[PDB]
């Protein structure tokens, strides 16, 4: 069995040796993270030496649908190409059913971050973050994409206060749609209207998340409340006259008025 690349356009490999490639070309140092989707690894390369963080699938593909699902998160990430304030992929392979993906290293997502902390996030490092996500938003935007899945968990850190947008596995081309969080779902989304619009709405409600320590809601009552067009009125006093007004304008029910990211970094406080 061999590793064959995987695009939309090996020193310490030996094939002859019964390991994966995986495991001849690579030092596992950490497990970053387990769930359904398979494990994140921290590991350095026995070619370069680099640091990187390597993905892989649970199980086999169950068939073909499930092989073309699981790698369009590599053509998402190749339609998104560079961008400072995306996670760069390296390259992906396939090896025995499993798929295998190998970006640059970062920090901790923003979900483990704010974890850490346990305390809401001061506003400082909230504006940081809000101008990099925005950045990469209008990246994507401007290239008729659409993430889909902004939160916390797929936010992650880098050096000096910045960070990263990531996990391209539900980024759609308009020109197809899988389940998002309804936690962080733009109310459109519930009646089939997709679009950029969506991805403002996310972010809305992950900021409102970490600056204010609150958890959102997976349904019902609560869920409604964040999207009629007023933030709930116990968190919201802490924060600033100007993030509570950027607030509004990224949660705005409407997709026809809400704010793009273009025109949210072009204002005033979002500046350099
Ligand atoms: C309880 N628990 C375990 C968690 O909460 C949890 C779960 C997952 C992660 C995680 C996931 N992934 C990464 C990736 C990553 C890899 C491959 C890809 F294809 C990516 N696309 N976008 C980004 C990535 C990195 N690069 C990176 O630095 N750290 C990561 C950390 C962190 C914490």
Not at 171 to 180: A, D, F, I, N, S
């Given at each position: 069995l061999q590793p064959r690349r995987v695009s939309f356009r090996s020193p310490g490999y030996d094939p002859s040796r019964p390991e994966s490639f995986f495991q001849q070309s690579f030092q596992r140092l950490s497990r970053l993270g387990h769930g359904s989707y398979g494990e994140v690894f921290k590991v350095r390369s026995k070619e370069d030496g680099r640091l990187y963080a390597v993905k892989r699938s649970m199980s086999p593909?169950?068939?073909?649908?499930?092989?073309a699902r699981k790698?369009?998160?590599?053509?998402?990430?190749?339609?998104?190409?560079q961008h400072p304030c995306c996670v760069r992929?390296?390259?992906?392979?396939e090896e025995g059913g499993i798929l295998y993906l190998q970006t640059e290293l970062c920090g901790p997502s923003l979900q483990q971050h704010c974890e850490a902390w346990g305390a809401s996030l001061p506003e400082a490092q909230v504006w940081?973050?809000?101008?990099?996500?925005?950045?990469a938003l209008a990246h994507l935007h401007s290239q008729g994409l659409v993430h889909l899945d902004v939160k916390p968990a797929?936010?992650?850190?880098?050096?000096?206060?910045?960070?990263?947008?990531?996990?391209?596995?539900?980024?759609?081309?308009?020109?197809?749609?899988?389940?998002?969080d309804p936690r962080y779902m733009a109310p459109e989304l519930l009646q089939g209207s997709y679009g950029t619009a969506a991805d403002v709405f996310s972010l809305g409600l992950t900021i409102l998340e970490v600056?204010?320590?609150?958890?959102?809601?997976?349904?019902?009552?609560?869920?409604?409340?964040?999207?009629?067009?007023?933030?709930?009125?116990?968190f919201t006093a802490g924060l600033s006259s100007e993030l509570r007004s950027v607030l509004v304008m990224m949660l705005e029910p409407d997709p026809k008025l809400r704010a793009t990211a273009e025109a949210l970094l072009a204002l005033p406080v979002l500046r350099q």
């Open positions: 593909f169950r068939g073909p649908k499930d092989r790698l369009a998160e590599v053509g998402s990430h190749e339609k998104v190409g992929l390296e390259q992906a392979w940081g973050y809000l101008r990099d996500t925005l950045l797929n936010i992650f850190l880098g050096p000096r206060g910045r960070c990263k947008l990531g996990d391209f596995g539900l980024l759609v081309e308009l020109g197809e749609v899988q389940e998002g600056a204010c320590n609150m958890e959102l809601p997976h349904g019902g009552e609560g869920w409604q409340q964040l999207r009629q067009g007023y933030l709930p009125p116990e």
